[PDB]
Amino acid sequence: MMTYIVFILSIIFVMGFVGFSSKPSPIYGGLGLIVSGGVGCGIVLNFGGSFLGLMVFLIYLGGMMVVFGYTTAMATEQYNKVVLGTFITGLLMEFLMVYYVLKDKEVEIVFKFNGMGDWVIYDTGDSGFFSEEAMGIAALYSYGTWLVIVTGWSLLIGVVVIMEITRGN
Amino acid sequence: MNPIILIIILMTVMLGTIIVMISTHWLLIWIGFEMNMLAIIPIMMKKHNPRATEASTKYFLTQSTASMLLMMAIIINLMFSGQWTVMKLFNPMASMLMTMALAMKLGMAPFHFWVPEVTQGIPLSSGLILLTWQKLAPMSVLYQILPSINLDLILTLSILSITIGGWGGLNQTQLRKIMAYSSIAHMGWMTAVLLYNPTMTLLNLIIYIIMTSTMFTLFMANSTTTTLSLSHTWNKAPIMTILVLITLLSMGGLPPLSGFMPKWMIIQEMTKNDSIILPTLMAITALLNLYFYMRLTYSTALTMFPSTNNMKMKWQFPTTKRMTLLPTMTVLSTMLLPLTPILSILE
Amino acid sequence: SMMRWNRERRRLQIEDFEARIALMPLLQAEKDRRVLQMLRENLEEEAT
Amino acid sequence: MNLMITLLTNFTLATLLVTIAFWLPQLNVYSEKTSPDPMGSARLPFSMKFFLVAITFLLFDLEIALLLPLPWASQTTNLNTMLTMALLLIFLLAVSLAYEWTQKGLEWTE
Amino acid sequence: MSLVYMNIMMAFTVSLTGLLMYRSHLMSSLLCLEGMMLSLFILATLMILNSHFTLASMMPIILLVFAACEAALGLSLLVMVSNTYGTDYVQNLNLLQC
Amino acid sequence: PGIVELPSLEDLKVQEVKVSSSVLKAAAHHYGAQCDKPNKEFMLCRWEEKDPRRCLEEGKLVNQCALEFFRQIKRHCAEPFTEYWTCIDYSGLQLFRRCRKEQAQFDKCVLDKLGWVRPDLGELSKVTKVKTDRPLPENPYHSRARPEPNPEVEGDLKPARHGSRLFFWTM
Amino acid sequence: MFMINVLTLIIPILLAVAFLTLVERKVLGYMQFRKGPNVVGPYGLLQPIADAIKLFIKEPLRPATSSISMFILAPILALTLALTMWIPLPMPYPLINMNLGVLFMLAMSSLAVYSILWSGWASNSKYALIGALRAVAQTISYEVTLAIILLSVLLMNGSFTLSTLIITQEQVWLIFPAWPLAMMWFISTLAETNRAPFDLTEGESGFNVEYAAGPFALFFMAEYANIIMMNIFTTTLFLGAFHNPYMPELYTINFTIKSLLLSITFLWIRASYPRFRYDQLMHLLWKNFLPLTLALCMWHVSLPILLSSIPPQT
Amino acid sequence: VAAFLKNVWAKEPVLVASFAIAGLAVILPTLSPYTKYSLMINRATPYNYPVPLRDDGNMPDVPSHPQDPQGPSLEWLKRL
Amino acid sequence: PFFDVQKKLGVDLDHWMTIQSAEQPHRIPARCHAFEKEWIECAHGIGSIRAEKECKIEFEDFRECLLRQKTMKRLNAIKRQRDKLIKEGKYTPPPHHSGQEDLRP
Numbered sequence A: 001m002m003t004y005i006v007f008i009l010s011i012i013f014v015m016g017f018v019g020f021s022s023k024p025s026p027i028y029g030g031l032g033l034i035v036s037g038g039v040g041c042g043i044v045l046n047f048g049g050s051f052l053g054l055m056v057f058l059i060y061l062g063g064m065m066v067v068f069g070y071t072t073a074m075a076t077e078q079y080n081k082v083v084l085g086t087f088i089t090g091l092l093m094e095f096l097m098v099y100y101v102l103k104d105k106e107v108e109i110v111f112k113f114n115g116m117g118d119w120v121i122y123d124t125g126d127s128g129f130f131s132e133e134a135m136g137i138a139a140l141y142s143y144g145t146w147l148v149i150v151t152g153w154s155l156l157i158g159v160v161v162i163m164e165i166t167r168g169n
Numbered sequence B: 001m002n003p004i005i006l007i008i009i010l011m012t013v014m015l016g017t018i019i020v021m022i023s024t025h026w027l028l029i030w031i032g033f034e035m036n037m038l039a040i041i042p043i044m045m046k047k048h049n050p051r052a053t054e055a056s057t058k059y060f061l062t063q064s065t066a067s068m069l070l071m072m073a074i075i076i077n078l079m080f081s082g083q084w085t086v087m088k089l090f091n092p093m094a095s096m097l098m099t100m101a102l103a104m105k106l107g108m109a110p111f112h113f114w115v116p117e118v119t120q121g122i123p124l125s126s127g128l129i130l131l132t133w134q135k136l137a138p139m140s141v142l143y144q145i146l147p148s149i150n151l152d153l154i155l156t157l158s159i160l161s162i163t164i165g166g167w168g169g170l171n172q173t174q175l176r177k178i179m180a181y182s183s184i185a186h187m188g189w190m191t192a193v194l195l196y197n198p199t200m201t202l203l204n205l206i207i208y209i210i211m212t213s214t215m216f217t218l219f220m221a222n223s224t225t226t227t228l229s230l231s232h233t234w235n236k237a238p239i240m241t242i243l244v245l246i247t248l249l250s251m252g253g254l255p256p257l258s259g260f261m262p263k264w265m266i267i268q269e270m271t272k273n274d275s276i277i278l279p280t281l282m283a284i285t286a287l288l289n290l291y292f293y294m295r296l297t298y299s300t301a302l303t304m305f306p307s308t309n310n311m312k313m314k315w316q317f318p319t320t321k322r323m324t325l326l327p328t329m330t331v332l333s334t335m336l337l338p339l340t341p342i343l344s345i346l347e
Numbered sequence C: 001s002m003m004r005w006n007r008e009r010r011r012l013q014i015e016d017f018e019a020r021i022a023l024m025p026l027l028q029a030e031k032d033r034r035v036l037q038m039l040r041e042n043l044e045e046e047a048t
Numbered sequence D: 001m002n003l004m005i006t007l008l009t010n011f012t013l014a015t016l017l018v019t020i021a022f023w024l025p026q027l028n029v030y031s032e033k034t035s036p037d038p039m040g041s042a043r044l045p046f047s048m049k050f051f052l053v054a055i056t057f058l059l060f061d062l063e064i065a066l067l068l069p070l071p072w073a074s075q076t077t078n079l080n081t082m083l084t085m086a087l088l089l090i091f092l093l094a095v096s097l098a099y100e101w102t103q104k105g106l107e108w109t110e
Numbered sequence E: 001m002s003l004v005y006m007n008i009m010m011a012f013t014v015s016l017t018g019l020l021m022y023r024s025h026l027m028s029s030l031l032c033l034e035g036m037m038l039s040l041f042i043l044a045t046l047m048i049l050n051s052h053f054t055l056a057s058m059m060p061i062i063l064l065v066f067a068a069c070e071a072a073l074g075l076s077l078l079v080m081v082s083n084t085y086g087t088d089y090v091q092n093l094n095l096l097q098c
Numbered sequence F: 001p002g003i004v005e006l007p008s009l010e011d012l013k014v015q016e017v018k019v020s021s022s023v024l025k026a027a028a029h030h031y032g033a034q035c036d037k038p039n040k041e042f043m044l045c046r047w048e049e050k051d052p053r054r055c056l057e058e059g060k061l062v063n064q065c066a067l068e069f070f071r072q073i074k075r076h077c078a079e080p081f082t083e084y085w086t087c088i089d090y091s092g093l094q095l096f097r098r099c100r101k102e103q104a105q106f107d108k109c110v111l112d113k114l115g116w117v118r119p120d121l122g123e124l125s126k127v128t129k130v131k132t133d134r135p136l137p138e139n140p141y142h143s144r145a146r147p148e149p150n151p152e153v154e155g156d157l158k159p160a161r162h163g164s165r166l167f168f169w170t171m
Numbered sequence G: 001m002f003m004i005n006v007l008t009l010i011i012p013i014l015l016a017v018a019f020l021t022l023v024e025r026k027v028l029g030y031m032q033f034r035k036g037p038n039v040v041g042p043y044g045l046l047q048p049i050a051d052a053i054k055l056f057i058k059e060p061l062r063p064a065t066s067s068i069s070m071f072i073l074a075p076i077l078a079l080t081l082a083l084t085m086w087i088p089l090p091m092p093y094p095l096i097n098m099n100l101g102v103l104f105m106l107a108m109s110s111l112a113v114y115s116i117l118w119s120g121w122a123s124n125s126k127y128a129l130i131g132a133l134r135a136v137a138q139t140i141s142y143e144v145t146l147a148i149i150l151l152s153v154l155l156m157n158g159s160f161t162l163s164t165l166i167i168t169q170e171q172v173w174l175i176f177p178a179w180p181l182a183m184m185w186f187i188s189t190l191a192e193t194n195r196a197p198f199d200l201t202e203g204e205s206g207f208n209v210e211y212a213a214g215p216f217a218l219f220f221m222a223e224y225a226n227i228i229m230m231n232i233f234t235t236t237l238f239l240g241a242f243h244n245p246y247m248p249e250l251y252t253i254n255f256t257i258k259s260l261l262l263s264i265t266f267l268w269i270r271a272s273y274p275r276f277r278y279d280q281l282m283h284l285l286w287k288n289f290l291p292l293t294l295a296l297c298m299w300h301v302s303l304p305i306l307l308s309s310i311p312p313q314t
Numbered sequence H: 001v002a003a004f005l006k007n008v009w010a011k012e013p014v015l016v017a018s019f020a021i022a023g024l025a026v027i028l029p030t031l032s033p034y035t036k037y038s039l040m041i042n043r044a045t046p047y048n049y050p051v052p053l054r055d056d057g058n059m060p061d062v063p064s065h066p067q068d069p070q071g072p073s074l075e076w077l078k079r080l
Numbered sequence I: 001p002f003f004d005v006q007k008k009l010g011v012d013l014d015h016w017m018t019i020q021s022a023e024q025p026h027r028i029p030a031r032c033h034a035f036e037k038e039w040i041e042c043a044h045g046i047g048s049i050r051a052e053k054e055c056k057i058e059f060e061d062f063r064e065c066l067l068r069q070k071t072m073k074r075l076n077a078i079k080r081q082r083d084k085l086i087k088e089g090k091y092t093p094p095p096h097h098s099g100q101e102d103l104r105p
């Protein structure tokens, strides 16, 4: 069962998505999204992407969901059947999908998926004296000149836009 | 709003459209789309009233949903092809998701519900910017991926857009909602002729852009947003009544005006591929667009509605608005049929 | 001080990398023989 | 492997300490209290200043995410291009800060 | 293909159906939208890392940056409508029916 | 499709260099200096053929040369090399700068016993040239025949016959 | 065997926190011309034990919380994130050797504000919520300068690994080439852990006014663990010690002395100056610290290129 | 132009220091003679294998052994 | 419209990312470099209509490298037959497949 760790983490990810997507309350949705983001970062880390998972923790959770919950605290003043119904039925489709995957080791819904453990797709070689994802990200200042330019311009324009529309005049 | 900040934001909108047009990478297409939408949001909220914020909220939600669907299609295509070159797609699911994302961005039916409300809630100049410039990039992306487009899906979207646009515009009295439903019908025509000859789509896009620009420019020149306020124009400037009469006749596709040429060439192209029922149905449906255009011309130019007393006070002053390019697009939208073979420059 | 110590560290890194470069042909040969043995054993058990 | 063992140990030690801190005076039977903020029932006033500083933090955090791979990126051969792109990114950070400064964005929470 | 791909597609579909059916609040719609982006992040990152596409490793960072700027714009719009009406309910954004 | 061909288990049989990583790292520079020719021949065969089954014999020769290198080390300089790889093996990152004294002792011993000189900086990272007798693989990717290209444009451009030929237009 | 390492990491943290309370009381007393506790034990050595037992037999407040879930969860997160920010610290060998330990620490520090947010929202008091929102805004606004300063300092290191930070300072201390970054980093870490002259929640409602005495003690213990951790991180960054690979006790004693001196400097700071206003510290950050941090970041990007002193990647 | 600098250095010294440091950082790497050393130090670091070339017969520059005189040299790095 | 500004101007704004078999930093190869190279050397210069039919086997090999459905299916069938034979009791696993091999290097 330890070879299925990424699969189990993906199950927790989709279960948290069902939980927060039922919309019980905006703050509880934010809490469920935080938990789901943590589990997804765990998936990425177990796949080998340390830098991208730590970006998820630093920017998505520590930097942006803070803003979401901060805005949620400035509205939605503090103190159902639908929420419980959709949570129950989403859990039902999820566990039915898991049972159909693991019983026959193959499934088709829109694409064809295989029920074996996901350690099979990994590469048998070593990367030498560097990590491949860090070199790929580090090539942004040497190769991605145009990407840097358009992203920075969009960020500055976003600052200008937010300052423009919240003024009220 | 600062003039310099307005200039920077408008060049950011055009920069996003250019980035979509010139790039060979799917991520750059996505980046250009978000840059364009983020920059165009403050143009909608120039006046700061609750209607503008409501329209901006609905526009933001629709464009964000369409953008997420587009990214989903791109990621599926990368998964099934291993590359990002903007060309034909290698998965029917990716093609369907991208086609519906571009349909949501264009506002074609049944994703049309945001267009009239958004056009109504924003000023005339921002509505002109939206309905004219915002549609250059999704049609370019559609122009790049036609080997992967499902024919049944795009033809269903086209006929649904034409019928829903005509039936929707039959009931409106506000000018911006009429322009929105007219836009929906014209995008139905454009994506109807897309898979047979995209040059006809480019020609229809250019002609619709010119006609819409002329009509919106006349609207802001006279500062009219309703039917009756437009009907007051005969007692202020009758030359504008003549101009709106000829432009609305040309918008209905009546020969020998320049609006006849797009549907004429579209019907010419569709019959070469042994499709006869659809061009007849689209012409019969475009008769409804002609109907509410003719109702507008009745209320404005061919009759004299009663005016009020203060029109004399308005007589004593001349206009000073910068009606930019208004005679040029007025001429180019009515007397361009003898230059029909000029469409070969677009191939 | 940082300039002198970082230049020395760069020289040490170059020495370490060139030691690895001298080593790794033998590791490449061993890895190739090992993966060929694994494939042969799996093929024989698949035949069984 | 060892990392998630340590994470589980820290989580279970924290939840053990919190459980003992909660439920130990629960075993006491002290009393029952009726108890019948300076504002009584006033609505929370919506302030644009706190939202503005939150959004400014978010945007600067995004440009920080862009700036993060500089120690790895300094090892490239194309040093002139990397230096120019790094200086351009931090210059855009400074320009956004200056635009917030001049248009009274940092006002009454300076 | 693999299994975690199926789970991430189903997570994206769940977040999409959550966004496409509003309950009461606009904030829940924004949360569903950002969960959709997070699922896109995980899917693209797993595909790029498994395919050993080195130069594509910069894409999820740009995706995160652009969609978080999108979310900042959406939060500003939500704050504006909350200042207008006193709450962020989606039933108060119905003036443009007429 | 086809049946993948694998060498028999007797063809993969060779006696191994059964030494640890720090033992390899201590004499790495001298191994690169002394046993360079069969290593570079094997690497050229590997990067050219793109198939380990075509480089099995070169790898076997690499093993033989490395084994003889370590036998020659053992004959004369067993004790200083043993101390050197011991103090290399103590370190967590296996640093070369924590064992300079024993390195100098081993280098001096092997210089006066075997005449070996360690390479300087950048020498082992050079690109060398290899004289081999095996022929170059003319088609190493096993690619099949490429599709024939379309015929291109030839001839001068002439005006259109009777213009556009679009309905009634005579131009 | 590894659980022994985990336990001997995490139990001395709590012991050092309790004796940090005692040391701060005694040092503030001797700095205010008086004595600290010296009656409960010999020189007050039994004061934390008595105070802990008293706080753990105190009556709970039993509030009318809006959500008991996050009311439980906020001290859980505070204590877990206080204890989990010690595992990549080299002492001189980290318990969990991380390739990206510095950025892992940044992620945990950025994640630490949810305890403040949930403690503010769980309490029914609106003034408590307002105080929590102000504290969260100050915390994230100083996260910004923490990130820029750490990024600019790391350009002399060459990687995000915390163990290489000892190797970099093998020649000279890193406070010599980066002392303005050291001063700004020290003030930013002082304002990061909500300490004087930035502890606005004690000046005129805290974010945990409705919390019981036990959970309040847990929050305060997490804050003190954060203080010790930040001072150890600052010592590793700027005041690196001599590490003999055969005698690790030399490095352990050296950085222990330096980090204790830095924490005593924290207590020395807290009893010298008046508190800031909210807008005054926002002015100090957005208009004083941030432009100089950006200028020094550009300087420390462009400097190792012009000096031919790029640190090695590995 | 001259009294403006004195006034702005008496009034906002933090911004003067920030702008001066920024100007130094942006004009000094184009002026220093050690940038080329950084370039050829970064490009002389051996990350991957130096794959040998098949000897056709005409390569006098390419060495047949690492200790051969021909080839790139790092004596400039050893001295500096 | 697809205005090829990059080819007209000679700039390279996004072609470096556009394929996986392109110039990658530190000469790092991808998992399916060879298959993608063969497919591109097919499809170049013949249009999409001819390349969708002429050497489709290169694209099938590329897709099999990318997603590996056939290899997964073959491994599933082999393991299923092994499980059936193990449960029915007519197959004994070898020592080297049970962790008692003492691997080569």
Ligand SMILES: CCCCCCCCCCCCCCCCCC(=O)OC[C@H](COP(=O)([O-])OCC[N+](C)(C)C)OC(=O)CCCCCCCCCCCCCCCCC
Pocket (backbone or CB within 6 Å): G180, G182, G183, G184, G186, G187, G197, G234, G238, G269, G273, G284, G288, G289, G292, H011, H012, H014, H016, H017, H020, H021, H024
């Ligand atoms: C870790 C090592 C130890 C660190 C220090 C620990 C002990 C010292 C503790 C001090 C007291 C701490 C408590 C109070 C904290 C809050 C107050 C505070 O810090 O305010 C900061 C104050 C705030 O400034 P301010 O508010 O006074 O500024 C006035 C601004 N107006 C007019 C708009 C109101 O100063 C700074 O922010 C400066 C930061 C450090 C600057 C370093 C510059 C280095 C030199 C650059 C070059 C200069 C020459 C010119 C250019 C040459 C180019 C070649």
Ligand SMILES: CCCCCCCCCCCCCCCCCC(=O)OC[C@H](COP(=O)(O)OCCN)OC(=O)CCCCCCCCCCCCCCCCC
Pocket (backbone or CB within 6 Å): B010, B125, B126, B128, B129, B132, B133, B136, B202, B206, B209, B210, B213, B217, B220, B322, B323, B324, B325, B329, I001
């Ligand atoms: C294959 C095709 C590829 C692409 C080919 C090229 C396509 C071109 C598309 C043009 C799109 C035009 C978009 C709308 C105008 C943009 C400029 C703008 O911002 O105008 C609005 C602006 C607002 O200013 P304000 O003063 O607030 O106005 C309110 C009234 N007082 O200012 C005003 O309101 C001033 C009043 C006059 C405005 C006149 C604008 C005319 C623009 C259209 C010209 C004709 C179309 C272009 C040429 C033909 C292209 C096919």
Ligand SMILES: CCCCCCCCCCCCCCCCCC(=O)OC[C@H](COP(=O)(O)OCCN)OC(=O)CCCCCCCCCCCCCCCCC
Pocket (backbone or CB within 6 Å): G015, G041, G042, G045, G046
């Ligand atoms: C990493 C290191 C951490 C160290 C943490 C602790 C630091 C401080 C250590 C202790 C310092 C000295 C404390 C002395 C306490 C008083 C001892 C004493 O004499 O108590 C007498 C009292 C009454 O006695 P009685 O018999 O009534 O007298 C009549 C006779 N004429 O009798 C009583 O009160 C009853 C008996 C009390 C005995 C108390 C003994 C000390 C308890 C210390 C607790 C912590 C110990 C260390 C734990 C961590 C290390 C293992």
Ligand SMILES: CCCCCCCCCCCCCCCCCC(=O)OC[C@H](COP(=O)(O)OCCN)OC(=O)CCCCCCCCCCCCCCCCC
Pocket (backbone or CB within 6 Å): G039, G040, G046, G048, G049, G050, G052, G053
């Ligand atoms: C089954 C049998 C066991 C049952 C459970 C009991 C466990 C042991 C509990 C502690 C020992 C019991 C006796 C407690 C003290 C009683 C005697 C007393 O009152 O001594 C007073 C004396 C100081 O005299 P004082 O009145 O303060 O005079 C001031 C100076 N003029 O005081 C002193 O000199 C110091 C007294 C120190 C008391 C012991 C040390 C503290 C408690 C340590 C253990 C519990 C806490 C462990 C750590 C928890 C985490 C912080």
Ligand SMILES: CCCCCCCCCCCCCCCCCC(=O)OC[C@H](COP(=O)(O)OCCN)OC(=O)CCCCCCCCCCCCCCCCC
Pocket (backbone or CB within 6 Å): A034, A035, A037, A038, A039, A041, A042, A043, A045, A046, A050, A053, A054, D001, D003, D004, D007, D011, G073, G076, G077, G080, G081, G084, G097, G098, G099, G100, G101, G104
């Ligand atoms: C309200 C809910 C409860 C709240 C309290 C509890 C949760 C919050 C507090 C704890 C936070 C834990 C964060 C864990 C991830 C941190 C990043 C990380 O693991 O970095 C270390 C390392 C990457 O570094 P590197 O050196 O590259 O790896 C070794 C390379 N040779 O990576 C590795 O070594 C990878 C090891 C395998 C993968 C580990 C996956 C861990 C489990 C998933 C996440 C768990 C937390 C989920 C909840 C988040 C918050 C809600």
Ligand SMILES: CCCCCCCCCCCCCCCCCC(=O)OC[C@H](COP(=O)(O)OCCN)OC(=O)CCCCCCCCCCCCCCCCC
Pocket (backbone or CB within 6 Å): D091, D094, D095, D097, D098, D101, G291, G292, G294, G295, H008, H012, H015, H016, H017, H018, H019, H020, H022, H023, H026
């Ligand atoms: C070109 C170099 C590189 C540039 C890019 C990198 C920049 C790094 C630093 C980023 C700083 C970002 C924020 C800048 C804000 C400047 C505008 C400003 O604050 O103006 C207002 C201020 C007067 O203050 P006040 O209006 O009262 O505001 C309340 C605070 N007292 O006004 C002032 O105090 C006057 C500020 C303007 C004049 C400053 C002159 C400094 C000259 C230093 C020596 C020359 C350095 C070389 C560069 C050329 C500079 C012109």
Ligand SMILES: CCCCCCCCCCC1=C(C)C(=O)C(OC)=C(OC)C1=O
Pocket (backbone or CB within 6 Å): G014, G017, G018, G021, G022, G025, G047, G048, G051, G052, G055, G216, G217, G220, G221
């Ligand atoms: C495992 C539990 C260990 C004991 C709990 C932490 C140590 C006790 C702290 C008590 C305390 C002391 C001494 C204290 O002096 C103090 O004043 C600043 C507090 O805050 C009001 C305290 O909470």
